[PDB]
Structure formats: structure tokens, C-alpha cells
Design a protein around this ligand. Structure first.
Ligand SMILES: C=C(C)c1cccc(C(C)(C)NC(=O)Nc2ccc(Cl)c(C(=O)N(C)C)c2)c1
Ligand SMILES: C=C(C)c1cccc(C(C)(C)NC(=O)Nc2ccc(Cl)c(C(=O)N(C)C)c2)c1
Ligand SMILES: C=C(C)c1cccc(C(C)(C)NC(=O)Nc2ccc(Cl)c(C(=O)N(C)C)c2)c1
Ligand SMILES: C=C(C)c1cccc(C(C)(C)NC(=O)Nc2ccc(Cl)c(C(=O)N(C)C)c2)c1
Ligand SMILES: O=c1[nH]cnc2c1ncn2[C@@H]1O[C@H](COP(=O)(O)O)[C@@H](O)[C@H]1O
Ligand SMILES: O=c1[nH]cnc2c1ncn2[C@@H]1O[C@H](COP(=O)(O)O)[C@@H](O)[C@H]1O
Ligand SMILES: O=c1[nH]cnc2c1ncn2[C@@H]1O[C@H](COP(=O)(O)O)[C@@H](O)[C@H]1O
Ligand SMILES: O=c1[nH]cnc2c1ncn2[C@@H]1O[C@H](COP(=O)(O)O)[C@@H](O)[C@H]1O
Lengths: 353, 353, 353, 353
């Protein structure tokens, strides 16, 4: 007799995938108030951040100005690779010359990516991010492994992106110092629609963590974060840091000029797999768009950490490590409606909503 | 082999959370007609109300005028604490001097909250509501316990808010005379989005009740009530009273002036954790907004009790205590669409819809 | 350890409720083409209709003109009771004098309802419909029983409305000749919102049928039917006839004048529990609104039967009795989107969509 | 004790139906990059295509121009039958005279359909598509069988449409060379609403394949495909080719003139069961509408194959046959929201979104 959803193979539909909106954190016994929570966390095996946030390696998000401001806010930036090797390495130099700030840089896969990585390491980069659509591909695992054996002593090597336990386990055996999770949840991403491929971000973190935690390897949750609450959910699912693109793209520090359409303020934000970024045989997996202007980075980060601090008070988590042990309740479409404010016209501006 | 939603921990996603919209009451055998239902119910262990409704302790909802009108309608009001101690206590005096009416007042936690509580008790308040975001926090449980031991004989002490069985059990062992349930369902609340924390209100009541009912402690369902039907659902899930903010904020008795935008009538309604209420390092967990003007309180309460009376006739519940034994059917997104009127342009105004 | 949705009572949430939109009929082996399907079916134990459709007893739907046209189309009408007893009985006379046409009439419960029923029976009505919000109430069951014992020989007695197996079983033991199912699915109904009470219509039919079919008592599915496809679903769930309000209210034969707002054509349609119908202590359980004008009844019925005929060809059902043995597939929100036409601007008018 | 959704029959609701939007492909270990994927696949038992795509047999989609362009792009077209037999056969001749291109043609059931098929076979058609609403009907199975025995040696015979395992098994025993799947998922289809009949397309493919694969008979997934990602999902569910209507209707090669409403470009697209196509006793099962103009076919096909190539790289599938072994993760409504780009205003045009 058949599997309820079709066919005679119970593993054809392997699992049920949950995203951030499908779940809430459960309040627990607490001796923690928001002010006394400690928000520090491992970016990689060797690098601990004061604030568990990293800015995305995208040409509309992180250049030296964002990397500097992020590091000073206690987080880190990853410099995008959509520029010539000399300029990317130069921006690494601009950051390290602003007071020994932490900084990462993305590279792709191949000989040119190899030359890029070597120039970044010479410029003093702290973290190399091997930055690909599908980390489970053999080329990526080999590139991670070779950087690891070659520099490794010198620098941390992160690999992404993955959406499964087996892929995270493969990066760990390749020697990854951290594993970055997220195939298709990005706000500007179209992978799930163009290729039909991906995994909902909460389930993707839970699965990657089932592989990375036993190996002592930290998980970076990347993409799909829209609110401070999602950061707490990603960390409680077992991630150690979160990487943000659209939440940080509207900020003053993000590269790009202010757009003034309708006497309203916007900034361009685009996928690195979008047509405008890659530059007609290209098949793009991202879109180009715009986000509201959100003002200074510092005040965006204060709001995000403040929301995370509230979640730690609610779950009784004095540190990120205890937050990673929190429980979820799953919700329905109706519970999401309730979870957001409802049945009121919002008349005054809110900083975190 | 994994848990279907991710990882190897079957308790990581502890349960499935239902809100008011996810469920309907099942009709049952009835010898009860709406007119003959008895709507009385316990607010606390010592205090029984004629109508099982309480107005929220919010600066846009309950001041002496609302408390007076609520008590005369057979319910009760809880005076908000966003004012100086002398004025809050003075408003308690204004209410008690209108004919021995019942009244509650909110307090926070701490020495100033202690002084506030002592002035309220001296003014003759009947119920102290310890009014916090997270009742499971140690400070709140201690504050409940100390008020209980100190005044206790004199006054009833309610604690909130909670969303779990263990938190309700902790308030009961601290000596709470009632437990108030609701983390994040409020119409103006942003906790679930800012902190990612909460529990859907039907499941939250069912769980709190599993702890409070064996201890003979009544549950106040607080927040997320939009229609008279939700009140019946909350009571049938085991709550003894319901607390309303937005349903009562549009009324004449609510503090605040009438707003006339578009030749339409509104009243301001805002979270107590909203930016405008608390008064840039604040991290708000509510929004400021507006609700339609709904006219006299008395006629709003008549509609709410009338809807509750209909539910009692449908479920065969002569009293609230029997209603608390009713059954639910769970519905899908499509069943909600059907449950509301559909496929018609509503052309004339309805008092309860 | 708890029930997943809350508490320690596995029966508190008794079941999962499906509505028409949650399910599709499964195609089966067929030697039936739409043209050769036989659409006849039992209205009651004694009365078989050529077309398994009845018009609702509502003041915006069925008066003598609709009853006449319905009967001539092979269905039946139920004359509403929102008029004086002499006029209702007179309309029964107008119908019987148009060629021995079938006709029903609604009555409520009580002595006045008793006098009304006796005048209707004298006028020659074929079916008395005891027409109430909650058939499981003791007054309704007694009224059904007394009419049954008193007239019974003379006339058929239908009872409604019910949403459960136990309520349908109670009407059967009271002597009902048919059981009408539907609490809250009506397009103009607000019971599920005002009282929070009801059951999704597919599950409600399946349950009523589990009680009525073993007793040889036909089930009338009443309310929530928006498309011809829903009629086939209701019959396949085990109903023998369907009762329609909004699908027939836009027709020329429906009482009421044509409304011409925006150079568009509408007809008033309102719940019998709406404020305008019942005529400020009333608590209404319906709304007043308007529906598009749909032209002649005859061509609406042709479309509805044609859709039902297609379903019979698809399921291989030569008769309604075989259709009642068909199977459903349950769908998700995404399957409903797919089921309706999608991703196209509809530019030309369709008669059945 | 009852079945949770109603009644005492566990098979009344036979299964849970998934559509394309309910699922994503899971990334897997890969030694495949998009460029090196091989997209060839069986259309029928005897015919392998370079690109696993077929254009729909609809009067707004496939006439000789589309059939020619499709075949040159490595796919195939099926010429619609809403024209006189001499013109349809003539269009077959126009295609075969453009360099030995592959071509199919639709026929219905009956003697006229028989004469049509014989003229098509004489014109040199490669595939006859027996093109009906319900393939499980006895007339269709006999028509498939008779064509098979009569021509069979000469030509391939495909049968559709089906939505169940038993129906696909019946076509296989009738001698079908391929089975076409899809009852009601079409963008312009109204079967699920008019008749209430159908099955969600992912489950329908899984079930048909459970019957066709053991018999070595290829499955054509037909209808409901809106994005390149859906094609990959349909193939991974076990289909061998996909048939497209609306994705190809906006193209220059599609029959019909360009529409210029609002200084925007559209093309007419309509169901073959729509009122305008069939030409008031007709009961239509489709609508007439319009789709955006999408430019040259060639560049639409490049985008579709490019998306499919990405999915093959992500799942580690060097060929379509390995893709058919990929796994799904099921998603919720919230996961779909995430899967599409979200929380950004799309400002620049995307070729595949
Ligand atoms: C973050 C994403 C999705 C992104 C970013 C930049 C550029 C791209 C473009 C559009 C070039 N798309 C791909 O790169 N897609 C891809 C897919 C599968 C595979 Cl297997 C491969 C591949 O060749 N790998 C070695 C991973 C590439 C995607
Ligand atoms: C009803 C709500 C959500 C509300 C009402 C007024 C003010 C607030 C503000 C914005 C100050 N937010 C918090 O108070 N959040 C909070 C969270 C966790 C905790 Cl643990 C604590 C805490 O310190 N406690 C002792 C409960 C406080 C919230
Ligand atoms: C179809 C509906 C829902 C309808 C139609 C006309 C009028 C009404 C009004 C508004 C008067 N509402 C009720 O009648 N509600 C009701 C509820 C429970 C009960 Cl128990 C009773 C009752 O007294 N019964 C004897 C059934 C009545 C409802
Ligand atoms: C693709 C669809 C749904 C389509 C295409 C063209 C025309 C039609 C019209 C409107 C004529 N509708 C039907 O043909 N419906 C139908 C249903 C069941 C059946 Cl059993 C039969 C039937 O007689 N068969 C022999 C299959 C026909 C449908
Ligand atoms: O165009 C692309 N396609 C798919 N994912 C992308 C693309 N560009 C950036 N990303 C991912 O999306 C993340 C940002 O997602 P967001 O914060 O939800 O906007 C980045 O950190 C990358 O992991
Ligand atoms: O700003 C806040 N954040 C979260 N909850 C709040 C806030 N202010 C009031 N509440 C809660 O929300 C309830 C009112 O919810 P409502 O009736 O659904 O509008 C109150 O009774 C409080 O329990
Ligand atoms: O006002 C009312 N409240 C609830 N149900 C009603 C009311 N008036 C009519 N009904 C029911 O709704 C049905 C019509 O539903 P519709 O065809 O979905 O519009 C009627 O046949 C009655 O069973
Ligand atoms: O009018 C009709 N009713 C139902 N299905 C249709 C009708 N006309 C075409 N189809 C189907 O719909 C498919 C196209 O669906 P689409 O690509 O999703 O627009 C065709 O290949 C046929 O299988």
C-alpha cells in the first residue's frame, strides 16, 4: 500500500522542512535579564565574535566601510569578490589598518580563485570564505581542502553553502573551520524557483548541526533573516553566527548611493547571481532590487542584538551556548498572523518593526 | 534516522501550537438556550465575576472611567501603571468611590514596584496584577511570592505573563491567585518578531491549565482576542476569564481622544512596550497604532457576552465550568476562509462583525 | 507526556476538519460519460429529485417564483419563514397550483411555529423543514418528533442544522426523514466568528452520514457551496442533495430587485440571522450583502448539473449512489492555487467560473 | 473510533496530494556542474529527445511554426486538433519538410478521430497523442489500444490524461508508448473547480510512475509548470519529459497576434475546453485569457534548460535518469514565501523570474 504522498518509496520525500516563520522559541525558566545576557559566539573554531553577526559577501553589502563598522560593532564583514584581485586585497589592507580589526573575504573555486586567496592571505585576511552555490560539489570540497592544507595555519577557512547533514559532514572531513548554511533562503535568491532546489532554513541548520556539532565545527546561518527574532531562532537551532544581507543593505555603510524615488529613501540590493551583478546565455539565480534606507549600521546592530538579548532573557540563556539548547513550538499559518501585530493600522515608525 | 523536521532530537520541536483561528468549538447535545446560559466565572480564587471579561492594563485602554464601566458591566478593569504612583492610587480611589466597584491595578517588579503596590493596597485595590513580559523569570516569581506573603490576606495577586505549563506551575508554587497567559499573541505585540519567542494562544492556555486546574488556580487568557467567538474558545480551552485590549480600545470609555482621519473615527491604541509608551537604546516589543471607534463600552460588552451565550447554547454549557469541558475541531487555512463570511460584498454594518 | 497540541487530553481536539477546498475527487475507471450520468437522488426517504439541488429558505432566495422554477428544473425550493403565516401558506398554494410541483417550507420551533406548520400542511406542502441554528438542542428534537408523530403520514419532516455524528443520530431517533448538515459554512454566516462554533463541511457530512446512512436517512449538505465542483464533493462525501443560497441569489427568480452600482449588476443577499433580516440587544450570526447578478435560474442549474455530470464521468459514477462511494485526495494551500486557474489574466467571461 | 478527518472509512481520503510548490529538491553530493549535465530523455519508448520538453496541443500554443522551433531546440511540438483534418495533416507536412524534424499531433476519440489519425499517420507524424480529459474512461483505453494494434509499428501512441496509478496501469496494458499525467493542474484549467476532480501534480506523477516505470513506459508531466524549477521537480518525481502551455504561449512562435493593452505586450492563451475554443449548453472546463509576451522561443528554452542544468548540478545528476532518483523536502506555506525572493522590490527585469 502506498506512501500517503505518492509512490512506494517512503524516502522519496525525505523530510518536512521548517523555516523561521514556522517556529517560535519557547519561554523557559530564567535567571537572565536581557541586559545580563552574553552575546559572544564562535565564528570559526579559532575566532570568537562579541556579536554573533557577519555581513554578506555581496557587492551591495560589504566593502571596507561595512567591514570596518561591523568589526567595531563586535561582528565581522566578509568582503565581496565581484572586483579585481588587487582591489579586494587592498580593501583587506584598508580594514587591517583601522586598528587590527577582524575581516573576511570571499573567493570562488579555481586557479584564479587560488591567486585571489593567496593575495588575500598576504594582505592579512583572517577568514577565507569559499563562497559557492553548492558546497557539496566535488570542486568546492577540494578547494576547501587545499586551502586548508596550504595556508590553514595562517588563516581560517569557511565553506558554503550547504543545506544537508551529508554536505556539512563532507566539509568537516575536508577540514572546514566553519560551515555556512543556506541554499535558497536568500531574500534576493531565486534558486528554489529557477532550479527547484533547496531546504527550509530551520531544518537545514538542525541537520548541518547534527553533523558539525559532534566535530566541534561552528555553523553560520546565512540568508532568510528578516527580523531580530530570526537570528535568535537560527542560533537556538544550533547555528553559532548569522550572516545578513538585506538587513544590512539599507544602511549608510553599505556600498551604493541613496535612491530617492517618491520622496522615499532606498538602496540598491542585488543577488550576486543576478544579471546585473554577473556582468545572453547566463542563467541567473538572483534578482536585482532595492530596500528601504535604514540609517547608521550601529543603530541597526543595536536593535538586532537587543532583540537577541530579549530572546535570551525569555529562554533563560545566559550565553549563546545555552540558547543553542532552547526548544521550538511549531506554528500554523494562523499562528504567524497572530505572532506579527494584527488588526491595527501601524501609525508610528518602529525601529525594529 | 532523523526526526522528520531535522536533527536527532525528538524534543527540539516540543509541540505543535494552535491559535484561536486554528480551531472551532464542536456543537453538542444541549438543553441550554443562549438566554439561559450563566456567564459568571472566577477571576481569581476569591473573586467571581458576572461577566468573564477584564480590560487590559494599558494606557490606551484602562483608566478610572473604563474600570468603572467594566465593573458595572459585571467585569473588571486593570488600571495601567504608566503613571505616577499617586495618580494610579488616586484612580483606584475614584473607582472604589463609585459604589464599591471591583478594581485591579498593575505593578512591575522592584522596590518602586513595591512602593506602588503598597499604595494601591492602601487605596483599597482588590487585585494586584504583577504585569511582566516573562513571568517565568526569577525576579517575577519572587515578587509574586513576597506580595503574597505580605498582603495576601488583604488582596488577590495575579501573575503574568506565561506561555507554558512549567511557568504556570512555577507561579502556582509562588502562591499566585490566578495565572495570566499570553506571550506574543497581542494585536500590538511584536515579541514573536523581535525576539522570535512565544506560544500560540490556544496551546498556551491548554498547557497552563494542565498546571493550574489541578491546583484550583484560574487562568486569565490575555491577548489575541479579536471576536466574541475567540472568548468562547479561550474559555473552552480552560481559561476562566479573558483580558481584552484592542476590542475595548475603540470605546468611548477608553482614555484618549477621538481621531477623525478621512471623515472616519479612530482611537489611538499602542503597546506598553512601544516606543511612544516607554518614553535611542530602547528595544521595543510593541507598536503604536489606531483602531476603529466602536462606541459605548456597554454595547460592545453586550455583543461579546451575546456571542459567548450563543456558544454556550451550541455546546450545551449551562455555565462556564461546563464550557471548559467542550471539544475543538482543528481546521485548515481553507476552513478559516469558510468560517468567516465569504464570496459576498458586505454592504451593511454589523455590530459583532 | 503531553498531547502535541497541548494538555493531557487526547480528545480535547477531537478531530481534523476538512472543507470543500481541502479535497479533490479522484478520477476512477469509468464507463460513464457526462451525458449518460443519472443525476437523480433522494431529498428525503419518500421524495426523489431529478436534480439533487434545493434552494435555501432565505428571504433573498426562495419565494414562490424560485420554488416554481426550481421544481421545474427538477429540484426543489424551500420557502422562507420571514413572513406572516398566511403569506407563506399562500405561496405554497401558488406553487401547488402551477402543475403539482414539489415544494418545501421552513418553520422554527414553538407554538407559533406549530400553527405555521399546520397551515403549511393544509396548503399541501410536501416537506416541512425545521430550520434552526442548532438541531442538537432539545427543543428542536422535540419539535421534529412531534411533527413526525402528528402529520408524518401526510408530509416529510427534515431537521437541521447539524455538524456532528451524535446530532445526526439524535435527529434520526427523533424520526427525521432527512438531516440537514451545516453549522457555520454559509457564505453570509458569522457563527464561527461570533460564537467560535462549527465544523468544516466535508468532515461534517462524513460524520453525519456515518449516522444517517445506516438508518437509511438522506443527508442534505447545506452551505458553503461556491462552485459546481463542491456539489460533487458534497455528494461524494455521502450527502444526497445540496442546498444553495448564494449560488442562486443572483438569479432573476430570486426575490429582490436588481442593483445597479458602478454600471454593474447586483442582488441583495443576507443571512436570516443578519440584523436587517431579524427586524439594540440582538446578536446577529449573519451579514447583509450583495452578489453578482447571474441571470436566469435555468442556465445556472444547467451549469451546476453539467459540472456534476463531469464529475460523474471522471469518477465512473453512473448514478449519485455510486458517486457517494468515490474517494478524495487531500490537498495543501498550494494545491488549491493550482486547482483554480493560475498565472493568467482572465479576459473573457466564463459561465461556470 | 473515527478516522480523524471524518467517518469510519480510512480509505475515503485515500492520500495527501502534493503539488510543485509543496516540495523542493534536496542538494546532494555532486561531481556534476551545470555545463556537463546531459539533458536528453525518453519522450516515448522509441523516441529520445535532446531537451525533455514538449509544447502543448493547444490552438494558442502549437501550430507548425512552434513545432518546427521546438524540434530545432531539441524538443518537440504536438499540433493541436482544433482545426480541420486536412489542415492539421498539412501542418504535419510543413514540419516534416523542414529537415526531418520530429512532430506529434493530437486526436480525440471516435470515427472522426480515427480518420484524423489515419491522415496524420499518412502525413508522416511521429507521435499520435490521444488527447482527452479522462484517460481512464473506457472509450479512451479502447482508442489507444486500436491505434496501437493498427498503426503501432509505424508510429508512437501516447495516452492522456491520467492522475492515478490505476489509470496509468490501464493505459500501459492498452499498449501506450507513453502516459501523460495531469488532471486539473493546467494554468487555464477549471476542472478542479467545475467538477471538483483532480490530483496535485507531484503526487500524480509519483503514482503514475509507480505503474509506468516497472513497465518501461515513460511519463510526460503535463500542466502546472510555471518555472524552470518545476520541470526539474517533475523529472525528479519520475517523469521523463514535461509538456508546457503557458510558459510557451507568450512566445513569438506561438500562434496568435501580439496584444498591446496599456503599452504592454500580451498574447491570447486559452483552454481547449474554454468557451471560445469549443465554438448555450456547453459546460466549459477551461478559461480564455492572456499571458505576457516573452519573446523568441529559443531564449525561453535556453532559460528552462539552464534552470534544469542547475538542478542537475545541485543534485549530482549527470543525466535525467539519475535526476529521477533525487529526493524531495516537503515545505509549508512559509517555506514557499522564503523560496521565492522576498522583502525586496524587484526593480530590474529577470529572464527566468
Ligand atoms: C549563491 C548563488 C546561488 C549564486 C551566486 C553567484 C552566481 C550564481 C550562478 C548564477 C552563476 N549560479 C551558480 O553558480 N550555480 C551553480 C549551481 C550548481 C552548481 Cl554544482 C554550480 C557549480 O558549478 N559549482 C561548482 C558549485 C553552480 C549563483
Ligand atoms: C508585554 C511586553 C512584552 C512588554 C511590556 C512593556 C515593556 C516591554 C519591554 C520593551 C521593556 N521589554 C521587556 O520588558 N522585555 C523583557 C523580556 C524578557 C525578560 Cl526576562 C524581561 C525581564 O527583565 N523580566 C524580569 C521579565 C523583559 C515589554
Ligand atoms: C442559521 C443561523 C445561525 C441563524 C438563523 C436565524 C437567526 C439566528 C440567530 C441570530 C437568532 N441566532 C440563533 O438562533 N442562535 C442560536 C444559537 C444556539 C441555540 Cl441553542 C439557539 C436556540 O435557541 N435553539 C433552540 C437552537 C439559537 C441564527
Ligand atoms: C482537458 C480538458 C479537461 C478538456 C479539453 C477539451 C474539452 C473539454 C470539455 C469541456 C469538452 N470537457 C470534457 O471533455 N470533459 C469530460 C469529462 C469526463 C469525461 Cl469521462 C469525458 C469523456 O467523455 N471522455 C470520454 C473522457 C469528458 C475538456
Ligand atoms: O544571487 C544569489 N543567489 C542565491 N543566493 C544568493 C545570491 N546572492 C547572495 N546570496 C545569498 O543570500 C544571502 C543574503 O540573504 P538575505 O540576507 O536573506 O538577503 C547571502 O549571504 C548569500 O548567501
Ligand atoms: O507592547 C507590548 N508588547 C507585548 N504585549 C503587550 C504589549 N502591550 C500590551 N501587551 C499585551 O497585549 C494584551 C492586549 O492584546 P490585544 O487585546 O490582542 O490587543 C495586553 O493585555 C497585554 O497582555
Ligand atoms: O444568518 C445566518 N447565519 C448562519 N447561517 C445562515 C444564516 N442564514 C442562512 N444560513 C445558512 O446558510 C445557507 C446558505 O449558505 P450559502 O449557500 O453558502 O450562502 C442556508 O441554506 C442556511 O443553512
Ligand atoms: O481547457 C482545458 N481544460 C483543462 N485542461 C486543459 C485545457 N486545455 C489545455 N489543458 C491542459 O493544460 C495543459 C497546459 O497547462 P499549463 O502549461 O499549466 O498552462 C495542456 O497541456 C493540457 O494538458
Amino acid at each position: 500500500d502506498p506512501v500517503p504522498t505518492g509512490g512506494d518509496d517512503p524516502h522519496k520525500v525525505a523530510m518536512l522542512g521548517l523555516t523561521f516563520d514556522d517556529v517560535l522559541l519557547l519561554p523557559a525558566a530564567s535567571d537572565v535579564v536581557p541586559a545580563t545576557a552574553d552575546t559572544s559566539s564562535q565564528l570559526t573554531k579559532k575566532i570568537r565574535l562579541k556579536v554573533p553577526l557577519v555581513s554578506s559577501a555581496m557587492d551591495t553589502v560589504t566593502e571596507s566601510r561595512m567591514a570596518i563598522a561591523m568589526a567595531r560593532a563586535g561582528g565581522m564583514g566578509v568582503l565581496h569578490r565581484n572586483l579585481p584581485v588587487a582591489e579586494q586585497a587592498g580593501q583587506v589592507e584598508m580594514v587591517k589598518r583601522s586598528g587590527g580589526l577582524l575581516v573576511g573575504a570571499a573567493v570562488g573555486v579555481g586557479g584564479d580563485a587560488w591567486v585571489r586567496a593567496m593575495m588575500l592571505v598576504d594582505a592579512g585576511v583572517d577568514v577565507l570564505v569559499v563562497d559557492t552555490a553548492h558546497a557539496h560539489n566535488r570542486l568546492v570540497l577540494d578547494m576547501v581542502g587545499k586551502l586548508k592544507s596550504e595556508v590553514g595555519d595562517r588563516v581560517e577557512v569557511v565553506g558554503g553553502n550547504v543545506a544537508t547533514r551529508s554536505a556539512a559532514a563532507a566539509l568537516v572531513d575536508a577540514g572546514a573551520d566553519a560551515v555556512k548554511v543556506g541554499v535558497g533562503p536568500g531574500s534576493i535568491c531565486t534558486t528554489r524557483v529557477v532550479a527547484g532546489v533547496g531546504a527550509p532554513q530551520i531544518t537545514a541548520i538542525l541537520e548541518a548541526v547534527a553533523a558539525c556539532r559532534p566535530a566541534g565545527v561552528p555553523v553560520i546561518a546565512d540568508g532568510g533573516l528578516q527580523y531580530s527574532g530570526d537570528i535568535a531562532k537560527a542560533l537556538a537551532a544550533g547555528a553559532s553566527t548569522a550572516m545578513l544581507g538585506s538587513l544590512l543593505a539599507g544602511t549608510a555603510e553599505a556600498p551604493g548611493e541613496l535612491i530617492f524615488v517618491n520622496g522615499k529613501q532606498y538602496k540598491s540590493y542585488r543577488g550576486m547571481g543576478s544579471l546585473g551583478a554577473m556582468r545572453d546565455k547566463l542563467v541567473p539565480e538572483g534578482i536585482e532590487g532595492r530596500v528601504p534606507f535604514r540609517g547608521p549600521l550601529s543603530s541597526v546592530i543595536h536593535q538586532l542584538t537587543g532583540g537577541l538579548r530579549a530572546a535570551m532573557g525569555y529562554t533563560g540563556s545566559p550565553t549563546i551556548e545555552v540558547l543553542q539548547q532552547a526548544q521550538f513550538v511549531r506554528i500554523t499559518p494562523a499562528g504567524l498572523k497572530e505572532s506579527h501585530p494584527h488588526d491595527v493600522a501601524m501609525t508610528v515608525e518602529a525601529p525594529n518593526y
